[PDB]
Amino acid sequence: SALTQPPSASGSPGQSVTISCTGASSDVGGYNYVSWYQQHPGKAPKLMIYEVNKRPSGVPDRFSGSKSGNTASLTISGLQADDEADYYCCSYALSRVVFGGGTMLTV
Amino acid sequence: LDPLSETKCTLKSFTVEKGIYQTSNFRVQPTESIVRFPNITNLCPFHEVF
């Protein structure tokens, strides 16, 4: 299926924001096949959150992820100036990656 | 061809004596159509496992 993301997000520095992602599919393996990417204007994206109960190395603890049912959530504790970028969620359950419409996060 | 030839084949001989002398065969009514009535449904999520 296709993923749905808000058109844009807004939040003051220091506070927290949440990005919604509805439409993630599943299979006989599990329900945690959700990944997040951050792409700054003028460069390639970067894997920020994958397997939301975990996170890769070199990524600060400010980026957190969760999932309740068919909706995924991206929690950012602290907002900074270098956080303005397009955040996409990806579903890779049925051997097929699908990128959502994306959201514009501005501080 | 005819019951005489049938009872001849049953007796395995070209000459048949007086009387029935055997049971010719058994009548069996055959079918004329087919009725496949299974249920009514949508496809199977085999992609979720394979």
From Swiss-Prot, chain B:
It comes from the Viruses. Residues 27-43 are annotated as: Disordered. Glycans are attached at T31, S33, N39. Binds to host ACE2. RBD also interacts with the N-linked glycan on 'Asn-90' of ACE2. Cleavage of S generates a polybasic C-terminal sequence on S1 that binds to host Neuropilin-1 (NRP1) and Neuropilin-2 (NRP2) receptors. Interacts with host integrin alpha-5/beta-1 (ITGA5:ITGB1) and with ACE2 in complex with integrin alpha-5/beta-1 (ITGA5:ITGB1). May interact via cytoplasmic c-terminus with M protein. May interact (via N-terminus) with host bilirubin and biliverdin, thereby preventing antibody binding to the SARS-CoV-2 spike NTD via an allosteric mechanism. Attaches the virion to the cell membrane by interacting with host receptor, initiating the infection. The major receptor is host ACE2. When S2/S2' has been cleaved, binding to the receptor triggers direct fusion at the cell membrane. When S2/S2' has not been cleaved, binding to the receptor results in internalization of the virus by endocytosis using host TFRC and GRM2 and leading to fusion of the virion membrane with the host endosomal membrane. Alternatively, may use NRP1/NRP2 and integrin as entry receptors. This is Spike protein S1.
